[PDB]
Amino acid sequence: KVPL
Amino acid sequence: IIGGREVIPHSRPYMASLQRNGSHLCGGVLVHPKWVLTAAHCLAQRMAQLRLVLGLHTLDSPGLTFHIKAAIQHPRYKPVPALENDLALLQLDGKVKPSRTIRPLALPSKRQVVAAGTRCSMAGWGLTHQGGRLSRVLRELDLQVLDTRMCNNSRFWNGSLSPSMVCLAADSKDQAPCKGDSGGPLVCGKGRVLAGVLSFSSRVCTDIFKPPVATAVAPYVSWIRKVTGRS
């Protein structure tokens, strides 16, 4: 998960 | 937003831009005259230098600017790898009088369910190309809600999307919210209703095996209420  | 279209100037009066020294970081939605709901992961930051700008279309232009008196993270917020409960409520150091260009988006009922198939949109000033730069202008994208069992498929989110998360798809291979777009409000249905807040993707914005995902508002309406003091 790359948080935006 | 990669592959979106420019909004009609000021057609989405509830948009906030959370910025650090006039540099834009995330969107946010205005859910009350003194509160903007954004994503918690946006706030991993030195608050002194943070500002909320309201009423914007072009990103470098004045707009109404506010200091933040308190940043309240969801109590059960977990950052990456969890990234759970990715909401935070930002308090304005003033109070908004609604106008034509600045106005709050209402909360959904707590019982609201965002069913798969729901037609939604999502505005943001984020990146318009992988590796690229933020948008000069507020843009938007159409998003359909996908089925969670199906986003949890091993090739996609591989099991890790919880009931509170809304999984999303563009019409095309090549359209996706992107760096700078989190905190942006997902609005759904004919009556353009607050439904979610963008949270995360994978590193490549358009990665088809990692659809963008937002946090449903409905299950957190209660807390939003307690925190903002109203009912």
- Domain boundary assignment for chain B: 1-12+105-218, 13-104+219-231
Minimal-distance CA residue of chain B relative to A1:
B202
B86 catalytically annotated: yes
The residue annotated as part of the active site, out of B86, B121, B135, B199, is B86
CA B177 from centre of chain: 10
Q: Tell me whether residue B182 is one of the annotated catalytic residues.
A: yes
* Exposure of B8 in the CB half-sphere (CA atoms within 13 A): 4
Question: How many CB atoms neighbour CB B223 within 10 A?
Answer: 16
Give the architecture-level CATH label for domain B1-12+105-218.
Beta Barrel (2.40)
- Chain A residues within an 8 Å CB radius of B26: 4
Distance CA B83, CA B69 (A): 25
Q: Looking at CA atoms only, how far is residue B82 from chain A in angstroms?
A: 8
**Whether B171 is catalytic:** no
Q: How far apart are CA B78 and CA B39, in angstroms?
A: 12
Experimental method: X-ray
Fold of B13-104+219-231: Thrombin, subunit H (2.40.10)
Q: What is the resolution of this structure in A?
A: 2.7
The answer to whether B1-12+105-218 and B13-104+219-231 have equal CATH topology is: yes
Q: How far apart are CA B27 and CA B1, in angstroms?
A: 11
Look at chain A and count its residues.
4
Residues on chain B bordering chain A, Cβ-to-Cβ distance under 8 angstroms: 26, 39, 41, 79-81, 83, 86, 126, 160, 177-182, 198-203, 212
Distance between terminal CA atoms of chain A?
A: 9
CA distance B202 to B43: 19
Contact between B202 and B188 under an 8 Å Cβ cutoff? The reply is no
Amino acid at B99: S
